[PDB]
Every structure is written in C-alpha cells, then in structure tokens.
Write an enzyme that holds these catalytic residues in place. Structure first.
Site, PDB file in Angstrom:
ATOM      1  N   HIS A  21     112.149  16.460  36.767  1.00 12.51           N
ATOM      2  CA  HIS A  21     112.282  18.540  35.939  1.00 12.51           C
ATOM      3  C   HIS A  21     113.173  19.086  36.801  1.00 12.51           C
ATOM      4  O   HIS A  21     112.621  19.464  37.899  1.00 12.51           O
ATOM      5  CB  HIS A  21     110.935  18.163  35.731  1.00 12.51           C
ATOM      6  N   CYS A  66     117.432  18.914  36.313  1.00 16.95           N
ATOM      7  CA  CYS A  66     118.375  19.705  35.373  1.00 16.95           C
ATOM      8  C   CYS A  66     118.224  21.226  35.714  1.00 16.95           C
ATOM      9  O   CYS A  66     117.600  20.809  36.846  1.00 16.95           O
ATOM     10  CB  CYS A  66     117.400  19.928  33.807  1.00 16.95           C
TER      11      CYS A  66
END
Lengths: 4, 93, 140, 93, 139, 4
Positions: C88, C130
């Site tokens: 992430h 991301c």
C-alpha cells in the site's frame, strides 16, 4: 480489480 | 573527481504521482505482470529504459479495470520511470 | 564507455518486500494477488542473475533496518542493486504493516556517501503501490 | 480502446526533488549547457532517453560549484528524468 | 516500438525565459538565463521545432500560453515541447509575480484535454530549483 | 555560481  | 550522492538511482513506479495502482487478486498487479512478461522475453537483450518503456506501453494498452463499483470501473493506468542513471544499463555480459 | 560496467563476479542483490497483511488500525486491507507478484518477480530476477531475497509482511522499522543493513554489506563484487516494493502507499510514502514511511528514507541508505561500494553502480527500485487516490478514466 | 490521460509525457528536470539547481551567470545553467551540447552532437541519431542519460552524466561529472560562500562551494548536481513515454523517441525520419 | 514521426511538422516548442522578478516575490535576477534561452532556441530549432521565446512571464501569462497551445490543432505535428527557465520550488515554478504549480501548466496537454496530441510525446524541460538541499558529492 |  482492486487498488493499492 | 566527485560524484553526486543522488546519482545512479532509478525508480520504476507502477503509477504516476497522485494516482492509484491496479491489482488483480487473481492475476497480480498490472505493473508486475507487465514487468515480468517483458523481462522474461527481453531482460537479457534490451536496455533498462527500453524495457520500462515497453512496460509503460503494455500497462497502458493491455489493461482496463473491471469493478461492480462503477466509480472504479473501466479505469486506466500509466507507470512512471524516474531515472538518475548516468549510463545505459544492460543485465548481460 | 556509455554503458555501466557489468564485469563483476555477480550481478547483485535483489530484495523483495512483499506486504500482504496490515494492522487494522492502518485502515488498509489485505492485498490479495500480491503473493503471485512476489513469486513471478522472484523467478524473473533470479533468472536475470540476481541473488533474490523475499521478505514478507514487514513493519516500517523492519523495512528501514533491512535496507540499511543491505546498504552496509560489501557490494564491491556486484554490478548493481535492486529492490522491489509491493505494498500500500500514498504520495511519496509506502506502508509497512503498521504505518507509513517515506520512500526517500528507504532509498537514502544507498546514497553515494552512505553506500560507498555501490558508488557509480545502478541502484534500482521497482515500486508497486498507490501514490494517491486519483483514477484515470482514459480516452478514445 | 482507451489510453491513459497521463500517458506519453516526459519531464526532463534539471535536478532531483528537494534539491537546488546550479546556474553560472557567465555561461548559463549546468543542465541547459549539458543538454545543448548533447543535442548539438546527437539530437538526430540517439533515442531521447539515451540523450538525457548522457546529459545526466555530463552534469554529474563535468560540473562542480564555485562560490565565495563556503556553504555553496564545491557542490554537485544530478538531473532527473521522468518518463511516461510508451514508445522510443527519435527526432528524425 | 517507436513513436511515428512521419508528420508535416516536428511540432511547437515554447520557451519561457524568466529573468526578472517583481520585488514582492523576493527573487533575484537570473543572470545567465538569456544565454540558456538562445542556446536552446538554436538546438530545438535545428531539431525542427517551431520555437517561440516568451520573456519575464507572469503566472497568468504562463497559464494562458500553455492553455492556448494545448487548444491549437496539432494534427500535423509529431510532438510538443515546452521549456521552462525560472526560479522554483518543489512542484512549483516562479512567474514574474509569484509561483504556479507545474501540474497545472502540463495538465492542459492530458489526452482528454488535447486530442490532437493523443498518443504523441509531450516534452517538458525544466531548469528550476526543487528545494533547498545541496549535494556535497563524494570521492 | 548561484542557485535557482
């Protein structure tokens, strides 16, 4: 589909 | 004499600043599929930027998101290469 | 004289950090599909000639420490270094299982003045994460 | 079908994020001097990443700052290429 | 594997050469920049770009310049190029009168906002600071 | 030698  | 301390890094990001990055739970993330696919075929004969440019192209063209959530449906992705390299890079010889 | 010298005993180290599971307080969900990435990356980079090491579900501290120690090893006989981060993330930042740590601090360990044995050698970082919340709708 | 809206950009920055960029009042900035020399010699026969990589090398190696202010003395610089290109780029044919 | 360059024109090249700044911005004169702009004009002209140099642009002028450029018809061009010469900080560049985000300058050329540059290279060259750190070098 |  997924997001990071 | 001297070399900049930040010289000779390369950052191959899966996506551009500000954006999400797509991952298929069944097949893995888009960037990684594309990266491995092009490395398998050309990792030994193409220069690193030629490789990553082809990765950019494949992620950009071959993939499009599918979600039941329309907010996340039919979305696209472009990766992002940041090079502070000072020479060409080949993984062989 | 326009290509990195690749005439070393070894191509070099490839560190893979595969973060699938996160402390719930981070807000992050499980990254299903990431194991398949790590497997494919590992096979792929081993095939290139890298000494591949795979780490799983790392805390921020573990990530910082792991890369620091890697930067303190002797790379004199390696052509380059590679690190692959699967996690992430948000802009300029990457998730450990327990929070976020800046990408800048992870890579700073390998700066020319902090890792003299990788001086004038390529230091590669591949980052699947991301970098914000925007979506690209595409066109045409 | 679709192409990402952020696809096919290239950003050639004179320096890396967080850092200064050097300019000689008598001869101009380091990055532009380097860029023009390499373009002058190879603009028509090298792919753009080859061009910018050589520019990185020239900025990194040929330049070192001189200032009477010791804080700004003997400093170095590395440029920073950001590519979202999906093909190789040559300026001829 | 290569961008198709078989067009009537290489394309448009904008150079923004910011030398002098309003006293309110605090920024000093960027001596040496004219020599940059002239050298760039020659190189990019020689490559085939249609180069125009704008000097000491306000933030609004820079925004308008790129917006107008993105709204032209690039159908017969291979690509687009823009060169920014100025003071700057991370993600931002100085006009004569203040700072403007680099993102807003380049966003005009997104695929959905400039259809005639779709699938064509859009190049941006930026000579500007991106912060205050200094690289001391090594060895 | 000046910075930008």
């Amino acid at each position: 589909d997924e997001v990071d | 004499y001297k070399i900049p301390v930040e010289a000779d890094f390369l950052f191959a990001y899966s996506t551009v600043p500000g954006y999400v990055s797509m991952r298929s739970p069944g097949r893995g993330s888009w960037f990684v599929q594309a990266l491995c696919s092009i490395l398998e075929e050309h990792g030994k004969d193409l220069e690193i930027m030629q490789i990553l440019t082809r990765v950019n192209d494949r992620v950009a063209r071959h993939f499009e998101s599918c979600s039941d959530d329309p907010h996340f449906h039919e979305k696209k992705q472009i990766p992002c290469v940041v090079s502070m390299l000072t020479k060409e890079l080949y993984f062989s010889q | 004289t326009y290509q990195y010298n690749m005439n070393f005993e070894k191509l070099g180290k490839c560190i893979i950090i595969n973060n699938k599971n996160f402390d719930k307080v981070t807000g992050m969900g499980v990254r299903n599909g990431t194991d398949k990435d790590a497997e494919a990356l590992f096979k792929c980079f081993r095939s290139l000639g890298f000494d591949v090491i795979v780490y799983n579900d790392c805390s921020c501290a573990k990530m910082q420490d792991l890369l620091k120690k890697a930067s303190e090893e002797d790379h004199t006989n390696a052509a380059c270094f590679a690190c692959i981060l699967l996690s992430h993330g948000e802009e300029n930042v990457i998730y450990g299982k327990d929070g976020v740590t800046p990408i800048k601090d992870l890579t700073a360990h390998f700066r020319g003045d902090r890792c003299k044995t990788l001086l004038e050698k390529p230091k590669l970082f591949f980052i699947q994460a991301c970098r914000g919340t925007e979506l690209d709708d595409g066109i045409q």
